[PDB]
Structure 1
Amino acid sequence: FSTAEAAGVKVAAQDGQSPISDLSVVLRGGSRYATVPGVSHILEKFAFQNTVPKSALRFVRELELFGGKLYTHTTREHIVLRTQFLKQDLPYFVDAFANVLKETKFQQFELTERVAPVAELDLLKRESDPAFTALEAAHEVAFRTGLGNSVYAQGYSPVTLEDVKEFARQVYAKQNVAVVGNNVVPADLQQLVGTAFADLQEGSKVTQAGTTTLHGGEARVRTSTGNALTIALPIAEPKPVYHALASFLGGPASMPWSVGASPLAQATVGTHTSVKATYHNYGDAGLFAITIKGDSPAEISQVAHKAVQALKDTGAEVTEEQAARAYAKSKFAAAEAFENPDSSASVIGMELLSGVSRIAPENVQKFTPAELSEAAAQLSASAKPVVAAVGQVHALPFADEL
């Protein structure tokens, strides 16, 4: 991805040999910057609504003639708007993004009838998975605000058209916009973005209201639709070793009809439960989480104990074999993330919008058994463990029990 600048907008593109191009606008407008709860989700859903040059209807009908597709999502850090089309149709897609950023008519009926109902279905579909709920709850406990804001719009706190219009006035500005083109000729994209995004406001960098503060605690989301438990450990100094540790501890199987050879995978034997360790770097803080879902609260509780033990055991001693297995599983995870268009766009988006150079999968550091065990030790000896229980919460573990 050759990083450049076109009319004040950061543009990164990588040419390829495929008939298919992906163009993504990455906006510094994720939930950590949200003025009011849920606004970044609503703004994401307001993309490709009516603009002054082109109605939502006309856009969709023309997109179908090009056979293009549209993908949007919100993270804690970004809003990503991606289009996938044939290489030759690049000018159309550039101009469409320009219309969205410059000329969206944010109309009250769109909010009530189109945008908000879709945002509500989006959330309900996500929450069908109790593990999603548990990991969201865990970030809320760990960070409270900023990273602790909900990513998605919720019914208890309504977003108004004035809220969304104000946030869009901040976010849709040259300072908060990065363009990322997969299988796009880099010189051609710079020329088109340079003409199309020239009259976009310059604006200012959107910022998190307040510094990131870490907290421990418990969340007990009582649902009737499945059981899960997250054990998170907030990290004050994000370090790349936690990637290796997440992949080492593992959890999912690498093979059909198997349990797996990872410590967390082996914690689930005899139970219909799954587990997954994940590490989330957010630049200035991090979150190391282990999520366990299952149908039985008794089994979840059983695995939860084994999971915290696994982490303690890792803090004791890692073998050389296990450290190499961690390097391998981690390089692989990095590679596939740089391939997946959704995650790819945000990775380069972070490089362009912040200044955090991407770590290429081929440059993923190999951590010694010493470095891995030391990382696990800090986590086992955390002053601020977070535990989010979802489901039959009376039957799930508590932080002090773990």
Structure 2
Amino acid sequence: FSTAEAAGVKVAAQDGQSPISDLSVVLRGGSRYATVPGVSHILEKFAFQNTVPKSALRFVRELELFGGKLYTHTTREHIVLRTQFLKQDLPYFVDAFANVLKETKFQQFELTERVAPVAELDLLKRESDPAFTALEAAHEVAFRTGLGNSVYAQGYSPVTLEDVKEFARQVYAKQNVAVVGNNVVPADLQQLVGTAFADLQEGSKVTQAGTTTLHGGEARVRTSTGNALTIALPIAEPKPVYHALASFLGGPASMPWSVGASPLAQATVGTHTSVKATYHNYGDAGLFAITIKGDSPAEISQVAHKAVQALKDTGAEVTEEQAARAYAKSKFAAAEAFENPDSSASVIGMELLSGVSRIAPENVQKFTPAELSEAAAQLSASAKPVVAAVGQVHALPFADEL
């Protein structure tokens, strides 16, 4: 991805040999920057609504004629708007992004009838998985605001048209916008973005209201969608060693109908539960999470105790083989993340919008057994353990028990 600048907008493109191009606009407008709860999710759902030059309806009818597709999502850091199309249709897609950023008519009826209903179904579908809920609740406990804001719009806190209009005034601005083109000729993109996004406001960098704070605690969410539990450990010093740690600890099976050789995978033996170690680097802070979902709350309780033990065992001693396996699993994870268009866009988006140079999968550091033991020991000795039970919370473990 050759980083450049076109009319004040950061543009990164990588040419390829395929008939299919992906163009993504990455916006610094994720939930950590949200003025009001849910506004970044609503803004994401407001992309490709009526603009002054082109109605939502006309856009969709024309997108179908090009056979293009549209993907949008919100993270804690970004809003990502992606289009996939045939190489030659690039100018149309650049112009459509420009119309969205400069000329979105934010009409009340679109919010009531189109945008908010779609945002609500989006959230209900995600929450069908209790593991999603548990990991969201864990961020809320650990950070409270900023990173602790909900990513998604909820019913209890309504977003108004004035909220979304204000936030869009901040976000849709040259300072908060990065363009990422996969299988796009870099010189052609720069020329097009330079003409289309020239009249976009400059604006200023969106910032998180307040400094990121680290907290501990519990989050009991009584649902009936299933049972899950996140054992989260908030990290004040984001380090790449936790990537190898998450990979090592593992949880998911490497092959069909197996359990997996990973410590966390060998804590589910005998039960019908599923574990997953995940590290969430957020630049200024971090979050190490072990999410156990399953049908039986008793089964989850068992695995949860084995999970914390596994972390302590790592803190004691990792073998050289285990350290090599962590490197291999972590290199592979990096590679596939840089391949997947959703995550690829945000990786370069982070490099362009912040200045955090991407770590190429081939440059992923090998951590010694000593380094991995150090990492796990720091997590075992965290003074702020966060627990987030979802489901039959009366039968799920508490922070003090673990």
Q: TM-score, normalised by structure 2?
A: 1.00
Rounded to whole Å, the distance in 2 between the matches of 1:224 and 1:316 is 38
- Give deviations 1:103-139, integer Å, cap 9, x for gaps: 0000000000000000000000000000000000000
Rounded to whole Å, the distance in 1 between the matches of 2:357 and 2:41 is 27
2:265 corresponds to which residue?
A: 265
SS at structure 2 position matched to 1:326: helix
1:353 deviates by 0.0
1:367-386 equivalent positions in 2, closer than 5 A? 367-386=367-386
SS at structure 1 position matched to 2:355: coil
- Give deviations 1:15-38, integer Å, cap 9, x for gaps: 000000000000000000000000
Rounded to whole Å, the distance in 1 between the matches of 2:25 and 2:144 is 28
- Give deviations 1:353-379, integer Å, cap 9, x for gaps: 000000000000000000000000000
Rounded to whole Å, the distance in 2 between the matches of 1:356 and 1:27 is 16
Rounded to whole Å, the distance in 1 between the matches of 2:8 and 2:260 is 49
- Give deviations 1:136-161, integer Å, cap 9, x for gaps: 00000000000000000000000000
1:342 deviates by 0.0
- Give deviations 1:225-251, integer Å, cap 9, x for gaps: 100000000000000000000000000
1:303 corresponds to which residue?
A: 303
SS at structure 2 position matched to 1:50: coil
SS at structure 2 position matched to 1:204: coil
Rounded to whole Å, the distance in 2 between the matches of 1:3 and 1:225 is 44
- Give deviations 1:231-290, integer Å, cap 9, x for gaps: 000000000000000000000000000000000000000000000000000000000000
1:202 deviates by 0.0
- Give deviations 1:181-203, integer Å, cap 9, x for gaps: 00000000000000000000000
SS at structure 2 position matched to 1:315: helix
**1:353 is the counterpart of 2:350:** no
Rounded to whole Å, the distance in 2 between the matches of 1:251 and 1:273 is 10
Rounded to whole Å, the distance in 2 between the matches of 1:158 and 1:256 is 43
Rounded to whole Å, the distance in 1 between the matches of 2:33 and 2:225 is 31
Rounded to whole Å, the distance in 2 between the matches of 1:225 and 1:296 is 12
SS at structure 1 position matched to 2:4: strand
- Give deviations 1:371-390, integer Å, cap 9, x for gaps: 00000000000000000000
1:306 deviates by 0.1
- Give deviations 1:203-237, integer Å, cap 9, x for gaps: 00000000000000000000011000000000000
Rounded to whole Å, the distance in 1 between the matches of 2:54 and 2:349 is 27
SS at structure 2 position matched to 1:292: strand
Rounded to whole Å, the distance in 1 between the matches of 2:70 and 2:56 is 12
1:338 deviates by 0.1
Rounded to whole Å, the distance in 1 between the matches of 2:358 and 2:33 is 22
Rounded to whole Å, the distance in 2 between the matches of 1:290 and 1:307 is 8
Rounded to whole Å, the distance in 1 between the matches of 2:224 and 2:328 is 39
1:315 deviates by 0.1
Rounded to whole Å, the distance in 1 between the matches of 2:373 and 2:251 is 18
Rounded to whole Å, the distance in 2 between the matches of 1:238 and 1:296 is 34
Rounded to whole Å, the distance in 1 between the matches of 2:327 and 2:157 is 43
SS at structure 1 position matched to 2:313: helix
- Give deviations 1:14-61, integer Å, cap 9, x for gaps: 000000000000000000000000000000000000000000000000
Rounded to whole Å, the distance in 1 between the matches of 2:382 and 2:335 is 30
1:328 deviates by 0.1
1:159 corresponds to which residue?
A: 159
2:391 corresponds to which residue?
A: 391
> Unpaired runs of 5+ in structure 1?
none
Rounded to whole Å, the distance in 1 between the matches of 2:313 and 2:320 is 15
1:319 deviates by 0.2
- Give deviations 1:55-87, integer Å, cap 9, x for gaps: 000000000000000000000000000000000
2:180 corresponds to which residue?
A: 180
Number of aligned residues: 402
Task: Determine what percentage of the aligned residue pairs are the same residue.
Answer: 100
Rounded to whole Å, the distance in 1 between the matches of 2:257 and 2:225 is 25
- Give deviations 1:294-317, integer Å, cap 9, x for gaps: 000000000000000000000000
SS at structure 2 position matched to 1:399: coil
Rounded to whole Å, the distance in 2 between the matches of 1:281 and 1:365 is 16
Rounded to whole Å, the distance in 2 between the matches of 1:338 and 1:213 is 30
- Give deviations 1:2-22, integer Å, cap 9, x for gaps: 000000000000000000000
1:171 corresponds to which residue?
A: 171
Rounded to whole Å, the distance in 2 between the matches of 1:225 and 1:235 is 30
SS at structure 2 position matched to 1:321: helix
Rounded to whole Å, the distance in 2 between the matches of 1:238 and 1:301 is 29
SS at structure 2 position matched to 1:289: strand
1:38 corresponds to which residue?
A: 38
**1:51 is the counterpart of 2:51:** yes
SS at structure 1 position matched to 2:366: coil
Rounded to whole Å, the distance in 1 between the matches of 2:225 and 2:139 is 21
Rounded to whole Å, the distance in 1 between the matches of 2:395 and 2:257 is 29
SS at structure 2 position matched to 1:207: coil
Rounded to whole Å, the distance in 1 between the matches of 2:212 and 2:3 is 29
SS at structure 2 position matched to 1:81: strand
1:95 deviates by 0.0
Rounded to whole Å, the distance in 2 between the matches of 1:313 and 1:323 is 14
